[PDB]
Design an enzyme around this catalytic site. Sequence first.
Site, PDB file in Angstrom:
ATOM      1  N   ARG A   1       4.079   1.587   2.243  1.00 39.99           N
ATOM      2  CA  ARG A   1       3.612   2.965   2.404  1.00 39.99           C
ATOM      3  C   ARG A   1       4.241   3.734   3.543  1.00 39.99           C
ATOM      4  O   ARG A   1       4.346   4.957   3.456  1.00 39.99           O
ATOM      5  CB  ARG A   1       2.113   2.990   2.627  1.00 39.99           C
ATOM      6  CG  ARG A   1       1.320   2.554   1.426  1.00 39.99           C
ATOM      7  CD  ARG A   1      -0.056   2.207   1.905  1.00 39.99           C
ATOM      8  NE  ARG A   1      -0.941   1.813   0.823  1.00 39.99           N
ATOM      9  CZ  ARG A   1      -1.875   0.886   0.946  1.00 39.99           C
ATOM     10  NH1 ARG A   1      -2.001   0.250   2.103  1.00 39.99           N
ATOM     11  NH2 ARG A   1      -2.657   0.590  -0.084  1.00 39.99           N
TER      12      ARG A   1
ATOM     13  N   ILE B   1      -4.037  -4.932  -2.993  1.00 41.76           N
ATOM     14  CA  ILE B   1      -4.005  -6.305  -3.469  1.00 41.76           C
ATOM     15  C   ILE B   1      -5.356  -6.610  -4.116  1.00 41.76           C
ATOM     16  O   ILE B   1      -6.407  -6.333  -3.532  1.00 41.76           O
ATOM     17  CB  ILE B   1      -3.693  -7.293  -2.328  1.00 41.76           C
ATOM     18  CG1 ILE B   1      -2.238  -7.108  -1.884  1.00 41.76           C
ATOM     19  CG2 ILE B   1      -3.904  -8.732  -2.783  1.00 41.76           C
ATOM     20  CD1 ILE B   1      -1.877  -7.782  -0.578  1.00 41.76           C
TER      21      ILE B   1
ATOM     22  N   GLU C   1       1.186  -2.119   3.426  1.00 43.93           N
ATOM     23  CA  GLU C   1       1.257  -1.064   4.449  1.00 43.93           C
ATOM     24  C   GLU C   1       2.704  -0.721   4.790  1.00 43.93           C
ATOM     25  O   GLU C   1       3.035   0.440   5.041  1.00 43.93           O
ATOM     26  CB  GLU C   1       0.480  -1.436   5.721  1.00 43.93           C
ATOM     27  CG  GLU C   1      -0.986  -1.751   5.484  1.00 43.93           C
ATOM     28  CD  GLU C   1      -1.841  -0.538   5.161  1.00 43.93           C
ATOM     29  OE1 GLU C   1      -1.301   0.542   4.829  1.00 43.93           O
ATOM     30  OE2 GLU C   1      -3.076  -0.674   5.242  1.00 43.93           O
TER      31      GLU C   1
HETATM   32  C1  LIG Z   1      -3.954  -1.895   1.324  1.00 41.61           C
HETATM   33  N1  LIG Z   1      -5.205  -2.351   1.704  1.00 41.61           N
HETATM   34  C2  LIG Z   1      -5.602  -3.519   1.051  1.00 41.61           C
HETATM   35  C3  LIG Z   1      -5.930  -1.704   2.667  1.00 41.61           C
HETATM   36  N2  LIG Z   1      -5.310  -0.939   3.557  1.00 41.61           N
HETATM   37  N3  LIG Z   1      -7.239  -1.438   2.509  1.00 41.61           N
HETATM   38  C4  LIG Z   1      -7.623  -0.620   1.338  1.00 41.61           C
HETATM   39  C5  LIG Z   1      -8.878  -1.090   0.573  1.00 41.61           C
HETATM   40  C6  LIG Z   1      -8.721  -2.462   0.086  1.00 41.61           C
HETATM   41  C7  LIG Z   1      -9.110  -2.718  -1.355  1.00 41.61           C
HETATM   42  N4  LIG Z   1     -10.509  -2.828  -1.532  1.00 41.61           N
HETATM   43  C8  LIG Z   1      -8.431  -3.925  -1.941  1.00 41.61           C
HETATM   44  O1  LIG Z   1      -8.776  -4.349  -3.041  1.00 41.61           O
HETATM   45  O2  LIG Z   1      -7.335  -4.351  -1.429  1.00 41.61           O
END
Ligand SMILES: CN(C)C(=N)NCCC[C@H](N)C(=O)O
EC number: 3.2.2.22
Length: 246
Positions: A163, A71, A160
Site C-alpha cells: 500500500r 489477509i 502494508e
Molecule cells: C492489512 N491489515 C490486515 C490491517 N492493516 N488491518 C486491517 C483489518 C484486518 C482484517 N480484519 C483482516 O482480515 O486482515
Amino acid sequence: DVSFRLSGADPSSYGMFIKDLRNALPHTEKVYNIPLLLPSVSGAGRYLLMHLFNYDGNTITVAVDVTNVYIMGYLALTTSYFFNEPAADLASQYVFRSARRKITLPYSGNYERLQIAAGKPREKIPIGLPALDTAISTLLHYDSTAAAGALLVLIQTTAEAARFKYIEQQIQERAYRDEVPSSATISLENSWSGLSKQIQLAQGNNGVFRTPTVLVDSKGNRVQITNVTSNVVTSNIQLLLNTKNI
Ligand SMILES: CN(C)C(=N)NCCC[C@H](N)C(=O)O
Ligand SMILES: *[C@@H]1O[C@H](CO)[C@@H](O)[C@H](O)[C@H]1NC(C)=O
C-alpha cells in the site's frame, strides 16, 4: 499467485515481490494515478495466493482479499488457518479446500485484537526480512500467541508495504536487521482507509480533501494532509481502498 523467497533475498528481490503483489490486485480505474481497488469480486477470484518461503525453503501460502489487501488465512502443509471473522470464514469456502484440517484462529485480523493476543503493540515488535523469516517459521506449526505476533509481522511486510512505497522502503532498510516500525509507518498503516477515502472525495472537490488527514512524516513531526499535491498522494500511496468498502 505471487512468490517470495527469503533464501538469498535482498532489497531488490523484496521490491520485485512487492511489485508483483501490487500488480496481482485488479483495478479498472486509477484516481489521481493510483490504482483503485474494486468494490467487490465474486467467488474464488476475490482471493490472491502469496507463496512465501523461509530461509530453509519451507513454505506457507497466504490468502489475500484483493479488494482490501486483508489477509484472510494461510495454509501450512495440510492445515489451513483463518481469522475469526465473517470475511475469513467466507474465504474458507474458496481457498485451501484440500487441507486435511481447518483451524479458526482465536482472534480476528484487526490490529488491536492481534496486539492483545500477541501480548504487545506493534510499536514494540521488530519488523524486517529476518522477522518475516521467523514469522513463516512460526506459522508452520500452530501456536496462537506466537502466531498473533507472526501475523503482525506478515501483514506489515506484505500488505502494508504493497500500500505504501515508504513502508516498502522501510522493510528494504531492514533486509538484514530487524527494527521496530518508524512512527510514520504506524501512522500510514492507521491512515490508509482515511487517505483512500479523501483521495476519492477529492475527484469532485478540486483535489482538496473534505477532511484533512493528520500524519507523522519521516522525522516524528505531526502533519496535516489537505490535498492531492501532497507527497503522500503523489509519491507514497500505491493502492486505494474503494470508498464503497469504507
Ligand atoms: C492489512 N491489515 C490486515 C490491517 N492493516 N488491518 C486491517 C483489518 C484486518 C482484517 N480484519 C483482516 O482480515 O486482515
Ligand atoms: C496543498 O498541499 C500542498 C503540499 O503539501 C501544500 O503546500 C499546500 O499548502 C496545500 N494547498 C491547499 C490549497 O490546500
